[PDB]
From a paper:
Human β1,[name] (β[name]) is a key enzyme involved in the synthesis of glycans on glycoproteins and glycolipids that are associated with various important biological functions, especially tumor malignancy and cancer progression, and has been considered as a promising target for development of anticancer agents. Based on the structures obtained from our experiments, β[name] catalyzes the transfer of galactose from UDP-Gal to a broad spectrum of glycan acceptors with an SN2-like mechanism; however, in the absence of a glycan acceptor, UDP-Gal is slowly converted to UDP and two other products, one is galactose through an SN2-like mechanism with water as an acceptor and the other is an oxocarbenium-like product, presumably through an SN1-like mechanisms. While β[name] selectively binds to UDP-Gal as the donor substrate, it exhibits broader selectivity for acceptor substrates.
In total, we obtained eight structures, including β[name] in complex with UDP-Gal, Gb4 glycan, GlcNac-β1,3-Gal, GlcNAc-β1,3-GalNAc, and Man-β1,6-Man. All structures belong to the P1 21 1 space group, with each asymmetric unit containing two protein molecules. Using disaccharides as substrates and measuring the end point UDP concentration after 1 h reaction time, we have selected Man-β1,6-Man and GlcNAc-β1,3-GalNAc-α-Thr in addition to Gb4 glycan and GlcNAc-β1,3-Gal-OMe for further structural studies of the enzyme–substrate complex obtained from β[name] cocrystallized with UDP-Gal and soaked with various acceptors. The acceptor binding moiety has relatively fewer interactions in comparison to the donor binding moiety, resulting in a wider tolerance to different acceptors. The indole lid is turned off when no receptor is bound but is activated by forming a stacking interaction with the nonreducing end of acceptor.
Author numbering: 42 to 308
The structure:
Amino acid sequence: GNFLKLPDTDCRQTPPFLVLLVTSSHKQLAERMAIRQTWGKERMVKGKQLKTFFLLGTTSSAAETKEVDQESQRHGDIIQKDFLDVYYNLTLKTMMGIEWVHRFCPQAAFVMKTDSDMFINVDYLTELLLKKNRTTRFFTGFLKLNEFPIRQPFSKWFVSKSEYPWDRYPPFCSGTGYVFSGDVASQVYNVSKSVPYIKLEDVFVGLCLERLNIRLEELHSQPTFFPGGLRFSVCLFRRIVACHFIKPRTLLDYWQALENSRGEDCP
Ligand SMILES: *[C@@H]1O[C@H](CO)[C@@H](O[C@@H]2O[C@H](CO)[C@@H](O)[C@H](O)[C@H]2NC(C)=O)[C@H](O)[C@H]1NC(C)=O
Ligand SMILES: CO[C@@H]1O[C@H](CO)[C@H](O)[C@H](O[C@@H]2O[C@H](CO)[C@@H](O)[C@H](O)[C@H]2NC(C)=O)[C@H]1O
Ligand SMILES: O=c1ccn([C@@H]2O[C@H](COP(=O)(O)OP(=O)(O)O)[C@@H](O)[C@H]2O)c(=O)[nH]1
Ligand SMILES: *[C@@H]1O[C@H](CO[C@@H]2O[C@@H](C)[C@@H](O)[C@@H](O)[C@@H]2O)[C@@H](O)[C@H](O)[C@H]1NC(C)=O
Ligand SMILES: [Mn+2]
């Protein structure tokens, strides 16, 4: 599948319950280390297996290439293919992770694609997934159902009429963090080449899901995904799945907070 790097893992021997696919660029070593020491730490969660992998492309920098090679050797949790790792190549990065699930971890019950600047409560997520009784063609996160392409020309998410010619986008979930049943990876990979390309990964995936007639669903009666970020509180963070706008130092402090208060009860 042209994977310069493959994780040292065997999903047939121990099928994971939840696989985390984390996007980060080569220089963001601090982010990856904070995740590996916090919510990305592999463990049983209510007896369910959690695995964490980092999606990376390639870089022109010889120094960064070397560092990432050493990191892969030392940690074995990097999935890599030869594509220029840049913001407007995030669609390739996403499709690489989905390809990895399809070819090497079709046993995964659930897969979460997430950003590096995020806080994820796998405990609460696992609890909600076990409660949802939705194991096939399932896809959730922060639902974006009536979106219009951004035509403001210097905007990060700007798309020309040539890049996306229609007035509205299909349903999709924030690329900050979305979750799906493992089977969906195979279906998306399968239809990927037939769907109109878009440089925005979450929209691209939304196009594929629409082609597949897979409808987006809310994970819970209450909001659990926060692309806009949140005011921090131990009690609030115990009852959410994902929060954006979290830098590495902050992530470590939040993880420590939750550890320090483990054992107290909340309203
Ligand atoms: C996305 O990554 C692809 C693959 O690396 C980039 O395409 C290559 O661009 C390099 C220059 O960096 C050329 O030398 C190659 O001929 C291209 N190869 C292919 C297969 O296209 C592409 O430029 C990247 N996208 C963006 C927006 O930077
Ligand atoms: C003010 O919030 C922003 O509002 C725009 C619409 O006006 C849009 O909903 C933004 O979400 C982004 O939408 C992009 C496609 O247009 C998508 O590729 C990005 O990943 C979205 N970003 C987030 C944070 O989900 C929204 O931020
Ligand atoms: O070349 C790049 C640029 C960004 N990212 C990742 O893509 C996600 C989105 O980037 P960022 O948070 O900077 O932007 P946002 O989409 O929250 O505006 C993050 O996990 C980044 O680490 C990446 O893997 N490669
Ligand atoms: C998930 O299922 C729980 C167990 O209910 C039993 O099993 C499911 C698969 C159905 O066949 C149901 O008719 C059975 O009684 C429920 O307690 C729980 O509410 C379900 N969760 C949701 C979100 O509906
Ligand atoms: Mn981000």
